[PDB]
Design a binder for this molecule. Structure first.
Ligand code: HEM
Ligand code: HEM
Ligand code: OH
Ligand code: OH
Lengths: 181, 181
């Protein structure tokens, strides 16, 4: 199954450390996040919100970039990867109206998204989920997990990405910081 | 709402003329196709199959190709366009494992998908829906409609695409030919 649900509430595998409402409407503070590898028909009782998205095919990365990523990217659920962050992201209508070459040029040629991210591997494991096509309020659910040794480096990565050309088209963004239970 | 369902059965806006089971498991012959905007998980008891997909963002076309398409491509629902064809399509695992540059290279540089297609506009109107990400048995639901004057031209277009490098990666394909009621 390629579908995942993220339920903010009183159950889950991850404890919410803090929520930072970076841009646009935030998400209600909750105790934990419950991650399920399937769709949940409705938000459970007592839970505050549900996000969902699917794993999909590559949209921008070229073969040589995939080879570099696969050489170093770490697995999920490393014993030491006790910290994580869920970052839902929505991009603007202007972005989605652009053609494929226009979006690729912004994503890598101008912002060097993959090349920059590659510097912060293998410390940081990641997972990308898509959800605009499901009608969700966000466009992407991005997931990162790492050991505390890499907290400072991950903050530096965030600083670089938020300053990029790509991020000029980001319209809504929230950070849910997590600690593994 | 970007989700559409196609229910093969006894009711609907379109009458089935024939079903050509081009490649792989076919679709059971039915009387009509009913098209619904949104998702359904029931389908009337007199229905043989349901298909679903969503409209999404551009994946391969570049800006100059979009400009050429927009200059000539017709709208759906032309008074004269009383014939339609629904063509569900599934591509191989090998296709989906390829990177973005590799898939684009086959799609256009080698197969000339958009350049060939442009030759049959404005006669043929089209819609493209995606459904691999929904876990469906097909990957795409493609839709075409035209006046009878263009039936032979559309048959020619099919001939040319089925012989392309791109189509070497197609592993299931069906044609549901339809007439507007
Ligand atoms: C940590 C190292 C990172 C690496 C190696 C990395 C790599 C990538 C790659 C290769 C893609 C393209 C996938 C495709 O072609 O479909 C992608 C997509 C994306 N990533 Fe990252 N990334 C990293 C960090 C981040 C961070 C920190 C964020 C958010 C703050 C982020 C947000 C996104 C988004 C929103 C997309 C979707 C872009 C789109 O389809 O428009 N990534 N990432
Ligand atoms: C009639 C003229 C046609 C034109 C102008 C045309 C044009 C296009 C374009 C520009 C795309 C890329 C959309 C994107 O960038 O995401 C596309 C995708 C596609 N077309 Fe066509 N097309 C035509 C006919 C057909 C026919 C007759 C079929 C099937 C029998 C077909 C099957 C597909 C499929 C399956 C895709 C998705 C490709 C993929 O994502 O791998 N097209 N078409
Ligand atoms: O990512
Ligand atoms: O198409």
């Amino acid at each position: 199954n390629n579908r995942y649900s993220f339920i903010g509430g009183r159950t889950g595998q991850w404890q919410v450390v803090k929520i930072r409402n970076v841009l646009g409407p935030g998400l209600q503070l909750v105790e934990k996040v419950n991650i399920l590898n399937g769709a949940v028909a409705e938000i459970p009782l007592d839970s505050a919100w549900r996000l969902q998205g699917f794993a999909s095919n590559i949209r921008y990365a070229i073969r040589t970039e995939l080879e570099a990523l696969q050489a170093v990217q770490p697995m999920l659920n490393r014993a030491e990867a006790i910290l994580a962050v869920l970052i839902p992201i929505k991009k603007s209508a202007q972005w989605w109206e652009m053609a494929q070459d226009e979006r690729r040029d912004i994503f890598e040629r101008e912002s060097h998204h993959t090349a920059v991210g590659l510097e912060y591997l293998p410390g940081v494991a990641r997972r990308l989920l898509h959800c605009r096509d499901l009608g969700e309020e966000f466009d992407f659910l991005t997931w990162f997990e790492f050991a505390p040794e890499h907290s400072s480096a991950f903050n530096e990565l965030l600083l670089r990405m938020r300053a990029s050309k790509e991020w000029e088209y980001v319209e809504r963004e929230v950070e849910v910081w997590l600690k593994r239970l």
